[PDB]
Design a protein around this ligand. Structure first.
Ligand code: HEM
Length: 153
């Protein structure tokens, strides 16, 4: 599992995320869309946006970046005991939204990238390794639920 020392690394940087959830949410979703354009097409609500400036100006996008981060934070602060939190999420993502597990890998990379951009002094190698573990645990447990439902990635 993650050790208590790894969790403390993750939650320290996350409490910095929380100082500016909306800005972090925007940078993370813009990175995802720009790096992996296919992901934008999953969003009926956002697929009209074509340029980075248009993405930055959308209030709605910033609102959904808050939704995402707020759910992610709730999961993180359970420290691996996130069975309840994860169940609704993997259900809508598998069945309603149809999000492949690979795209969850992509958003994981975009979170890590942004956290390094914004918080270098608290996001050294040790905190990066810890965060990457925590995101892998999130993926692995969601992947298990997808398997059960018959969408595995
Ligand atoms: C940290 C990773 C993610 C978290 C915590 C997350 C969380 C959420 C939450 C809580 C909602 C709203 C409730 C829902 O229907 O379950 C949501 C909706 C949605 N998510 Fe995710 N999601 C994540 C990754 C993704 C990815 C990678 C995509 C697409 C490539 C995606 C696509 C959607 C879509 C399409 C909606 C519906 C948006 C709308 O029509 O309102 N999510 N997200």
């Amino acid at each position: 599992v993650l050790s208590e020392g790894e969790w403390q690394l993750v939650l320290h940087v996350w409490a910095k995320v929380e100082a500016d959830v909306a800005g972090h949410g925007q940078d993370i979703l813009i990175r995802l869309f720009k790096s992996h354009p296919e992901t934008l097409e999953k969003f009926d609500r956002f697929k009209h946006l074509k340029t980075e400036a248009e993405m930055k100006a959308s209030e709605d996008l910033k609102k959904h970046g808050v939704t995402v981060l707020t759910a992610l934070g709730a999961i993180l602060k359970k420290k691996g005991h996130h069975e309840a939190e994860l169940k609704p999420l993997a259900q809508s993502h598998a069945t309603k939204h149809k999000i492949p597990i690979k795209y969850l890998e992509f958003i994981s990379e975009a979170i890590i990238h942004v956290l390094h951009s914004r918080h270098p002094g608290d996001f050294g190698a040790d905190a990066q390794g810890a965060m990457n573990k925590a995101l892998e645990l999130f993926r692995k447990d969601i992947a298990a639920k997808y398997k059960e439902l018959g969408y595995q990635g």
